Structures are given as structure tokens and as C-alpha cells.
Amino acid sequence: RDWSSPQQPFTIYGNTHYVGTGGISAVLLSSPQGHILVDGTTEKGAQVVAANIRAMGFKLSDVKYILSTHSHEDHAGGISAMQKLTGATVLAGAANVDTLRTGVSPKSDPQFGSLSNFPGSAKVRAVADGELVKLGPLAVKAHATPGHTEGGITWTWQSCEQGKCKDVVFADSLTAVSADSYRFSDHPEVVASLRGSFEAVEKLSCDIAIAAHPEVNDMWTRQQRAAKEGNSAYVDNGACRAIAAAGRKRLETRLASEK
């Protein structure tokens, strides 16, 4: 379950399909009028994601948008390659647009000094908090969830099976991690952003959460349960509350360690 590992894709619910690697989530939200991909994984991982989309029966040329959670090599490193393969437009939070274009994270990132650059993408555009992305019958909402990066976005939609619908959340990372030389206690905008994001995420309508690092909501344990239980194994309307709580705990542990 390395970041770039192959991983057989699978449908989570309705038209929501996991197409990521063994280590990093990516999701294809499909329709007869074209598709939306959420995240790219790594640069090597793009080859996995592309093969996975095809294995689920879909054409790369029909992917019209790539939605970015945030602009680090593990989630976004494959976006440029996927963008070239699809012709899609890349959508991201305003403050991460420049990083997606250049592949270089800025000094405002807590991990600055310790991140590796990744391939810059073409066709990158900003979305605002609350904005709707539409494609045919698809409707995906952007929620600003900054803190781990300034332009982090958590993406939500509904997926249905013969008219039984669930609220799906692709949860951006909420983790307070840094370079050794960084003190969260000195950076009030990052702390305030993280706290605002914990509150936003724990309020989301959230039947099925898919975390950017899938193990964050126990994806692989859930998939094993699904073999027996079916796709109700992915359903847990407390999952966003749990991802937020874990974020809050990581930040509070860190601030205490800094005192």
C-alpha cells in the first residue's frame, strides 16, 4: 500500500468508484455525459489511476474535471499526467492553484523545507468555498478545508443506486505536520485554519467518507467487510466527525508538545 502501488478499482456506491493506488485515494464519479476524477495520486501513480479508470469501463477522454484536495506530491503528483491524458480542467482552492501549476509548495506550508516537488499541471482554475461544480447530472460541492495547505478543498456529492442515495465526502487531509524547524504555536493563521476545518468537516452531511489517505477511514477493513456485507460497509455517518476529531487530537497533541 505504497503511494504508487497498483490497486484493483472498485465501486463504493452507485457511480462513485475508487480508482486510486494502494496508498492514496482517487475517485471517479461517473455519468453518461462524462466523469469527474478526484485527485491524481503520485506521478507514477497516474499510470495506475488511468488503467483503473479504463478497468471500470470508462474512457479517459470522457473525464472532464480533475478535482484537487491539496497540492502535495502524494495526492497531486499525478494530476499533470492525468490532465494530459484526459484534457480535463483541474479545479482547486485558490491558494493552491500556483502550486499545482509549478509543482512547488510555498514557504507558508508547514512542511516547507521537507516536501518534494512534483510535475506542474496545465489548465488549473480556482473554485471558492461552497461553489458547485456541474457536469451533466453530476453536482459536486467544494468546501474550503485549509490548514494542512492553504487551498485545501473537501469535495461532496450524492450517489444513488435505483434511487437510494447517500451523501459522499472526499475528505482532504486535516493533519498538522511540519518540518523540524516549524512551530505551529508561531503561526496563528494555520492553527485557525485547521480549527475552522475540523468544525466544517464534523458538520458535513456524511454517509460515506473517502479520506485522501484511505486508511484514515479504514478503507481496507471496510472493503474486506464489504465482500460479505455489501457496500453498506463503506457507510458510517460518523466518519467525518471521526476524521475531524483525529485532526483536532493531532493538533492539540502538537501544541502541547510545543509548550
Ligand X SMILES: C[C@@H]1[C@H]([C@H](C(=O)O)[C@@H](C)O)N=C(C(=O)O)[C@H]1S[C@@H]1CN[C@H](CNS(N)(=O)=O)C1
Contacts of ligand X in 218-257 (CB under 6 A)? none
- Give the β-pairing of 16-18 and 63-67: unpaired
| Grid cell of 38 as nine digits | 478526484
Q: How far is the CB of 126 from ligand X (least distance, A)?
A: 21
Strand-pair partners of 209 = 169
Contact yes or no for 91/67 (Cβ under 8 A): yes
Residue 83 binding result from Zn ion, ligand X, Na ion, none, given CB thresholds of 5 to 8 Å by partner type: Na ion
- Residue 67 binds to Na ion (criterion: CB under 5 A): no
At which residue does the C-alpha cell 475540523 appear? 198
Window of 29-37, 143-151, 155-163, 249-257 that interacts with Na ion by CB under 5 A: 143-151
Interacting residue with Na ion among 16, 30, 83, 86 (CB under 5 A) = 83
Q: List CB contacts of 226: < 8 A, sequence separation 6 or more.
A: 232, 233, 234
Window of 32-40, 51-59, 208-216, 226-234 that interacts with ligand X by CB under 6 A: 208-216
CA atoms in the 13 A half-sphere facing the CB of 79:
37
| Grid cell of 256 as nine digits | 502541547
Per the annotation, binding residues are 70, 72, 74-75, 148, 213
The residues of the shown chain that bind Na ion, judged by CB under 5 A, are 6-7, 48, 68, 71, 80, 83-84, 92-93, 96, 99, 101, 110, 121-122, 124, 148-149, 151, 153, 177, 217, 239, 242
